[PDB]
Amino acid sequence: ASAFTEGTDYMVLEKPIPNADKTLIKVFSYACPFCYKYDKAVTGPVSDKVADLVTFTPFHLETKGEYGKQASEVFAVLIAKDKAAGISLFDAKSQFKKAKFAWYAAYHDKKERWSDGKDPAAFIKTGLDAAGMSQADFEAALKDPAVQETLEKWKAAYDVAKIQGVPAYVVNGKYLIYTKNIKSIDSMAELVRELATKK
C-alpha cells in the first residue's frame, strides 16, 4: 500500500533537484563520518534492492572539508569514466568506488588532512592512486563538458544538505529521507520504492 509517513520518514523538498526523475540521489561528503558508515553498510544493498526502479546517483557536497571541490572534480571524472565503461558504482572495479573509500579511510580512519588545504596535489593523489588514474588523465578528463555539467548539478547539494545533514538520500529529486529515522536496509528500500512511484 503506502507504509511511510510524511514528516517522519521523509519530506518533500521546497526546491527539488531538477532533472532527477527515477533516481536515488545520495548527497555525501568525503569528510562526513556518517556518509562513510552508510557507504560501508547501507548504500549498496539499498541501491541494489531498488535498481529495477531508480538509478543510484551520487551528489558530492563541495562545501564541506578543505578539499570538497577537488573531491567533487575527481568523483565527477571517475563516475563519468565508470559509466562510459558500463561499470556499476558498487563494482569492485569501479574507479569512483576505489577513490571514495580511499578518501574515507584516509580522512576518518587515519585522520589525514593533507596539510589543511594547502596541498591539493597530495589530496588528489590519494583518490587517483586508489582509482589507478594518472594526474594528467584526470586534468584532461576534467575538461569533458558532461563532467563540468555534473559539477554544476552538484551545486544543488548544499541546500539539501542543510536540512538534516549528510548523508542525504533523495528520491526522484523530490523526496528527502530522514537519515535518523531509517530503520533498516529492508525498510529503507521499500521507502525508496514507495517514493519512486508517487505520481
**Residue 11 β-bridge partners:** 176
What whole-number distance in Å separates Cα of residue 190 and Cα of residue 172?
14
Domain count, the chain: 1
Q: Which among 29, 20, 155, 138 is positioned nearest to 73, based on CA atoms?
A: 138
Residue for grid cell 539499498: 46
CATH number at residue 13: 3.40.30.10
For residue 159, what are the domain limits? 1-199
Q: Which among 172, 80, 96, 177 is positioned nearest to 130, based on CA atoms?
A: 96
- Helix 68-84 vs helix 120-131: angle between axes, to the nearest 10 degrees? 20
Q: Which among 166, 81, 67, 41 is positioned nearest to 126, based on CA atoms?
A: 67
Q: Which three cell numbers stand for residue 121?
A: 596535489
CB 124 within 8 A of CB 70: yes
Residue for grid cell 533523495: 170
Q: Which among 101, 120, 112 is positioned nearest to 38, based on CA atoms?
A: 101
Q: Collapsing DSSP states into helix, strand and coil, what is residue 198?
A: coil
Q: Which three cell numbers stand for residue 35?
A: 556518509
**Residue 186 β-bridge partners:** none
